[PDB]
Amino acid sequence: FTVTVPKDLYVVEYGSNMTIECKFPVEKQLDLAALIVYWEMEDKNIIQFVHGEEDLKVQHSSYRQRARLLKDQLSLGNAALQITDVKLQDAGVYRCMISYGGADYKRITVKVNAPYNKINQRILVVDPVTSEHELTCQAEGYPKAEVIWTSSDHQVLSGKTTTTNSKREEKLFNVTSTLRINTTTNEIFYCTFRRLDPEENHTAELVIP
Amino acid sequence: TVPKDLYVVEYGSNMTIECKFPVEKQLDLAALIVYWEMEDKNIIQFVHGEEDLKVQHSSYRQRARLLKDQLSLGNAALQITDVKLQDAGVYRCMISYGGADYKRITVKVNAPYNKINQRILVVDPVTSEHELTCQAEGYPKAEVIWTSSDHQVLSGKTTTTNSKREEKLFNVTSTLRINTTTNEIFYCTFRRLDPEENHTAELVIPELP
Secondary structure: OOOOOOEEEEEEEEOOOOEEEEOOOOOOOOOOOOEEEEEEEEEEEEEEEEEEEEEEOOHHHOOOEOOOOOOOHHHHOOOOOEEEEOOOOOEEEEEEEEEEEEEEEEEEEEEEEEEOOOOOEEEEEEOOOEEEEEEEEEEEEEEEEEEEEEEEOEEEOOOOOOOOOOOOOOOOOEEEEEEEEEEEOOOOOEEEEEEOOEEEEEEEEEEEE | OOOEEEEEOOOOEEEEEEEEEEOOOOOOOOEEEEEEEOOEEEEEEEOOOEEOOOOHHHHHHOOOEOOHHHHHOOOEEEEEEEOOOOOOOOOOOOOOOOEEEEOOOOOEEEOOOOOEEEEEEEEEEEEOOOEEEEEEEOOOOEEEEEEEEOOEEEEOOOEEOOOOOOOOOOEEEEEEEOOOOOEEEEEEEEEOOOOEEEEEEEEEOOOOO
């Protein structure tokens, strides 16, 4: 008897839902009087499954109404922890621990990627005689990002970027950048939100109307 | 024996399919053979405690691996990474240690519209007209249903083409034009039938300077 993990690492996007698995030998059928499943992370209990039931009282405050153990999977020899709406606090080392005659644990590490991939934009005519426009790009993510404006002819341009803490998601940043430029209908520009360590670029295409 | 007969697998993910066999004592890997195939193409040939990767078919060159730490437990776990629609079919496993026996496992590949890209364009701030867009790929064809925070169905413009990335899939992009203000919430729902399946992104109208 030993627990096995088909996936050692999980990379999961902010706000989405994850299923992290642990597999254990089940020759015949589950004797739920003998079955225990314990999920935790950084010494905080997520799930304690005993005598066929989830002990939700011992569940840590953080995970209330978010985490649960898929029970259809238990019959197959698979203890699947599903957590919904992944925060940046859910980055950590997750211990899964099962006792069924023998008893053994495995580790699973989770990283939470919070990309600047929901990009909002605005294009305004500031002065139609000089055909000066104001382009704007906003997005949210973690950590801080810089905005990089480029034209269709690959010219870097000077934008004005304003980084604040997000009024939606406490831990994320709200990055808004503004480009003033002279241009005409159908010309194409790009704003590119750049995170670092490791580098990651998300880019939206603005079409001047 | 096989705990799971049927696997429903996501497109582009990893799958782990399992065949169990009796193991009273420990593994003499000179005596052990494991063979995995689908449609007479070899996926894995494991012999003398080593993967015989020259017999492997082109299709599975660096994708197919046998989880070696789970051989110790009496369970041959075929793992294939980056699942295409071509991986739908019937997989045979055979193992010979002392005795010999085979099991068949059916695999179906779902390609859900669960990676939804979004963007919000402020068209005219005077009227406060915004242009919300959602796009995704999947199979089969899916409709998009736009709804407001109080769940009224709104009129949209949806465009469906064959995907350029993977031509068997479809690209579904939908745009909604609506007069609205900062912090109002909208939903774009990718729906697909026989059987029904819903995936929805939540779009929040931003505060721009």
